[PDB]
Scaffold this motif. Structure first.
Motif, short mmCIF file in Angstrom:
data_model
loop_
_atom_site.label_atom_id
_atom_site.label_comp_id
_atom_site.label_asym_id
_atom_site.label_seq_id
_atom_site.Cartn_x
_atom_site.Cartn_y
_atom_site.Cartn_z
N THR A 5 -2.57 1.70 7.13
CA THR A 5 -2.54 0.55 8.03
C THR A 5 -3.10 0.95 9.39
O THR A 5 -3.57 2.07 9.59
N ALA A 6 -3.05 0.00 10.32
CA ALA A 6 -3.58 0.20 11.66
C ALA A 6 -2.44 0.31 12.67
O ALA A 6 -1.72 -0.67 12.87
N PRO A 7 -2.24 1.46 13.31
CA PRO A 7 -1.26 1.54 14.39
C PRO A 7 -1.86 1.07 15.71
O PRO A 7 -3.03 0.70 15.80
N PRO D 2 -2.91 2.37 4.76
CA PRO D 2 -2.96 2.62 6.21
C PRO D 2 -3.83 1.61 6.94
O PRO D 2 -5.06 1.60 6.79
N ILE D 3 -3.19 0.77 7.74
CA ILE D 3 -3.87 -0.32 8.45
C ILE D 3 -3.07 -0.65 9.70
O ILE D 3 -1.85 -0.46 9.74
N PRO D 4 -3.74 -1.12 10.75
CA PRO D 4 -3.00 -1.59 11.93
C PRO D 4 -2.02 -2.69 11.57
O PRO D 4 -2.34 -3.62 10.83
N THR D 5 -0.81 -2.60 12.13
CA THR D 5 0.27 -3.52 11.78
C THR D 5 1.10 -3.83 13.02
O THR D 5 0.79 -3.39 14.13
N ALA D 6 2.17 -4.60 12.80
CA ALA D 6 3.05 -5.02 13.88
C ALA D 6 4.38 -4.29 13.79
O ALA D 6 5.12 -4.51 12.82
N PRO D 7 4.73 -3.44 14.75
CA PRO D 7 6.08 -2.86 14.77
C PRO D 7 7.08 -3.80 15.43
O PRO D 7 6.74 -4.89 15.90
#
Ligand SMILES: [Ca+2]
Ligand SMILES: [Ca+2]
Lengths: 238, 218, 231, 60, 231, 231
Positions: A5-7, D2-7
């Protein structure tokens, strides 16, 4: 689930302007109908146009309360080649401050459009007269002379019958908006001055009270627009 | 049917930002200024809830050779009855002083009721309150003006309001009237002197509920 | 933009106030007036509305300890300056978004809640020589720190009352009828505590604050706003 | 994956009112029929209306 | 590639400058000229445009402290060497991407912002013997470090002016008309502060820098570029 | 809402009880009565139902050590106060959600499980001078701490019995027929242990608790609820 994902450099951080929402608490929520209540109000501009009172000083008022920054002015027996009242075109002055528009703008960054200027008189009805009005755009000198006022954006109000009259500013600006805050009397915000002259002197019959009073208002016009609300100050708590 | 009462004289000693106020329905409860409602007023105690509107009039004597101005406006959810003593006003205080004038205590609302700390807590420094009055802002409310050049009376109507569709007849105090001097009284000497004031009222669409005996005593 | 849209306008978070960190079952502050010797645990029961308040209970006037010394205990209050200076209207209703803000770095904590007017009672029980305050579990949710964490959540309107009066003029009770006090106009109270037994009570001192945001509101009728002294 | 996500400020935290469920344990699960039992009861209001006894004091 | 596409060309981040870490409500530097004894908090109010600047205020010439010692306080400036050496055009407009860069390892911090020409005022209030600078909440967003964190964000064009002049020849004011100073050609100022009360002010010293990126720009008309001394 | 929906009502987690952390293969407590000298490892075998229980074995009455001192070993029990005070019905069946709750901060641990009525046997084997309790692997799952972690999971109905009697009036056995003891009405037992060999047994003391939630239940017939003493 587990997948590349993208951090982000600031994941989960808190900024005052976070745009989205979070997990809810519970379901089964019920709320009552507000239908019985009158007129939910949606926007500031709805109310901002209601004429508000100005706060002109009381000409060295000698009361122990001292000043009375009040929307009205008294009628003088004499007149001079200089306005009854003049002021810069600036939102920060007290007469602007405690208006609807002033209170709003106090928490905004920039302004656009025009405002309604309303006028009033309080003397005996047996009075006849006229007054001159002149908006002075920015120049190299604050207007004093009646002839100067005539060169400026000007009009004359008949006090013959109507003891009230209205005016609206013209929106002239090299920029879309103008700085609301009085950081300095500069080309960004400041827009000249206003002037007020009495056209002719008093005319009354006997038994009428003397040196009557003059009242004034202010409120937003249809074209007025503000930009970027800003935070407040609580010092009035003192 | 109409109901009416009386109010003090607008006097030259009165000034700008000087005023007096009346609560709804507290005026009937106190028969304020000679006010009398009678049958419905008594019914109040025998019914535990009610809901109604209003319709009013006010009058005062003027003359051409007077100058000065007055204002009339209804304002809801105010605590104007509360004195700095922390209680609503009886028939004596306003009947005596006859004209309130603005002061920081009411520009701030600091007079609102408060709690006794007890020895447990430090004493605070009272500085602020939310029920302030900013007179320059009152023009927002629909209002009417009574002036020598304008008139001698006024008429207004208002609807019901409250956090619930109906409220207890005894506690519901949503609406309050205030009358203020816009400009000090004056007239060339010998004219009509310090005129007195009177006020009239009608409820609109009143509906009693919670029928019971007259107010199980306190 | 159309910033003047009120619904959009106020939907942002802001600080409420601080409270002390809990380390055991607590004595809720007693109703006023309160006398010395009636020892009670002030400063942890976090009330949940920016109205004037005092000692985990509402308030009508505003008074503060402008002086640093005196007799008695110092209470605490809460005012939302931005919204209260912008609140030129009469009635209100909305939902409420809130998020945790720990003051102590590197903190491990647990928090709880109960709704408006919800009475409090915890007590504690000994798990193998270790007291377990009952509140560790109960009727209401809980959330925990990831050795520090931005716990967030929202709550709806809850009061039996149809709406929230922005400023008020009624009377609170049939006896001791406090004017200006609409009681049922908040969301309750929360409480932050260490996930340790009462025996593990520590000498260290800790504090936590919170930010609050208005959600999907509704407003009615005009209302005044403060004047400014010209000096 | 693996990718940008929302924490979230409180990811994986525990609140008493958590709304959703987690990983299961096993499959192949079988349960017996309750059909032989009388009248599964669903709601409190079903029973709350049965007249109950009051507890008035016995006069001294 | 078609690198010569200007819109694509400049959309990358670069350092602006450093600033000192804040630990309390700060005194904004006074307008020039400034005299000794008028103590003010220089070096935290981070201006937001690579124009020549001085002490959180714009600048027209470029002068620097080539010498290590002297009388008075050392100011700070900011120049984007790459873009300014590549800026052979006259007018400009775009959006602005920016990201945080902490200099101190292992830092916990909080940051804030206010727009172009937005005046500053914080003050502070005592939460239980602990001052709380008002800026901890307010009109503008905030973001925080995960014990260190790459906080990122973007802002749009904001000025009343239609466009940004690359280099300028007008006059700033009706009085003290500074040529070469277009005032309303930036995005405001930010400020980084510890999430601790003023009482927690520490002896340790900390610093932070930032990188800035141009977004979706527009350019007009030619303009010169620097000559090189042949030695 | 329609809160009165029982199925929705009880689907929330709550504490069961604490247990001691394991550091080796353990001696399961012997069947009662138990005599001094029959040393056994009490307080780690975590039974899995809020029924009255004692020493990892069920119980019928409720007795507790109201006094802090005496002869013998202190046992432990478990009661779900909320559900048991709300349980005005006769028969029951549902699934069970559960999650780990470590009491010691900064803990590294491993946990295991076996179902209802599942007998226990681990023993240990020496891996290069290091004992490896067989339970480190076996028939049932395991989960581990991320230096602390909220391990969660669910289990279904398992008993040969069709349903769970809320309160019971049968007889347990053909001999020593204990009334009020339905044996096959739980989910088994778990156990938390350090991921270290028996040789690494440490002086430090650690503890862990757990929360349990009811899932997709079914209820039958009325039942009484406790009376309250009027004092
Ligand atoms: Ca990812
Ligand atoms: Ca992600």
């Amino acid at each position: 689930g587990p997948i590349p994902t993208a951090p982000r450099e600031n994941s989960l951080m808190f900024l005052s302007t976070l745009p989205d929402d979070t997990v809810p608490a519970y379901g089964n929520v019920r709320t009552p109908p507000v239908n019985y209540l009158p007129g939910e109000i949606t926007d500031l501009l709805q109310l901002a146009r209601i004429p508000t009172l100005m706060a002109f000083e009381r000409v060295p008022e000698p009361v122990p309360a001292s000043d009375t920054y009040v929307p009205y002015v008294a009628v003088p027996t004499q007149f001079d080649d200089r306005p009854l009242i003049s002021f810069p075109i600036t939102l920060s002055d007290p007469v602007y401050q405690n208006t609807l528009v002033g209170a709003i703008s106090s928490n905004f960054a920039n302004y656009r459009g025009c405002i309604q200027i309303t006028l009033t008189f309080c003397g005996p009805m047996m009075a006849r007269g006229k007054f001159l009005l002149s908006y002075s755009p920015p120049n190299g000198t604050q207007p004093q002379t009646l002839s100067e006022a005539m060169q400026c954006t000007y009009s004359i109000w008949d006090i013959g019958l109507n003891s009230s009259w209205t005016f609206v500013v013209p929106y002239i600006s090299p920029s879309d908006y103008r700085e609301t805050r009085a950081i300095t009397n500069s080309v960004y915000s400041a827009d000249g001055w206003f002037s007020l002259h009495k056209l002719t002197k008093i005319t009354l019959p006997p038994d009428c009270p003397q040196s009557p009073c003059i009242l004034f208002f202010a409120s937003a016009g249809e074209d007025y627009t503000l930009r970027l609300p800003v935070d407040c100050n609580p010092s009035y708590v003192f | 049917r109409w109901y009416t009462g009386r109010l003090n004289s607008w006097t030259k000693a009165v000034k700008t930002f000087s005023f007096q106020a009346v609560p709804l329905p507290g005026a009937f409860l106190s028969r304020q200024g000679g006010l009398n409602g009678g049958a419905f007023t008594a019914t109040l105690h025998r019914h535990f809830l009610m809901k109604c509107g209003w319709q009013v009039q006010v009058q005062c004597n003027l003359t051409q050779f007077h100058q000065g101005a007055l204002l009339v406006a209804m304002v809801p959810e105010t605590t104007l009855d509360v004195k700095p003593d922390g209680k609503a006003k009886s028939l004596q205080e306003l009947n005596e002083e006859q004209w309130v004038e603005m002061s920081d205590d009411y520009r701030t609302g600091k007079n609102m009721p408060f709690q006794s700390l007890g020895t447990y807590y430090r004493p605070p420094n009272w500085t602020w309150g939310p029920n302030f009055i900013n007179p320059y802002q009152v023009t927002v409310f629909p209002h009417q003006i009574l002036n020598a050049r304008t008139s001698t009376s006024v008429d207004i109507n208002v609807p019901y309001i409250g956090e619930t569709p109906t409220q207890s007849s005894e506690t519901q105090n949503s609406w309050t009237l205030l009358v203020m001097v816009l400009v000090p009284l004056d007239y060339k000497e010998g004219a009509t002197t310090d005129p007195e004031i009177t006020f009239s009222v009608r409820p609109t669409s009143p509906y009693f509920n919670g029928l019971r005996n007259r107010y199980t005593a306190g | 933009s159309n910033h003047t849209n009120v619904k959009f306008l106020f939907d942002r978070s802001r600080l409420l106030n601080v409270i002390k960190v809990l380390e055991k079952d607590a004595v809720f502050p007693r109703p006023f007036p309160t006398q010395e010797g009636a020892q009670q645990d002030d400063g942890y029961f976090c009330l949940l509305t920016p109205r004037p308040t005092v000692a985990s209970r509402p308030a009508t006037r505003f008074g503060l300890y402008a002086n640093p010394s005196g007799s008695g205990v110092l209470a605490n209050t809460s005012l939302d300056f931005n919204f209260y200076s912008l609140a030129c209207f009469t009635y209100f209703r909305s939902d409420l978004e809130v998020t945790v803000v720990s003051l102590e770095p590197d903190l491990e904590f647990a928090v709880g809640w109960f709704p408006s007017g919800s009475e409090y009672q915890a007590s504690s029980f000994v798990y193998d020589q270790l007291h377990v305050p009952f509140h560790f579990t109960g009727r209401t949710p809980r959330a925990f720190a990831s050795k520090g964490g931005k716990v967030s959540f929202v709550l709806p309107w809850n009061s039996v009352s149809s709406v929230l009066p922005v400023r008020w003029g009624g009377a609170s009770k049939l006896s001791s009828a406090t004017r200006g006090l609409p009681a049922h106009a908040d969301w309750g109270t929360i409480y932050a505590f260490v996930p340790r037994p009462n025996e593990k009570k520590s000498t260290a001192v800790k504090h936590v604050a919170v930010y609050i945001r208005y959600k999907n509101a509704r407003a009615w009728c005009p209302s005044m706003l403060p004047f400014r002294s010209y000096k």
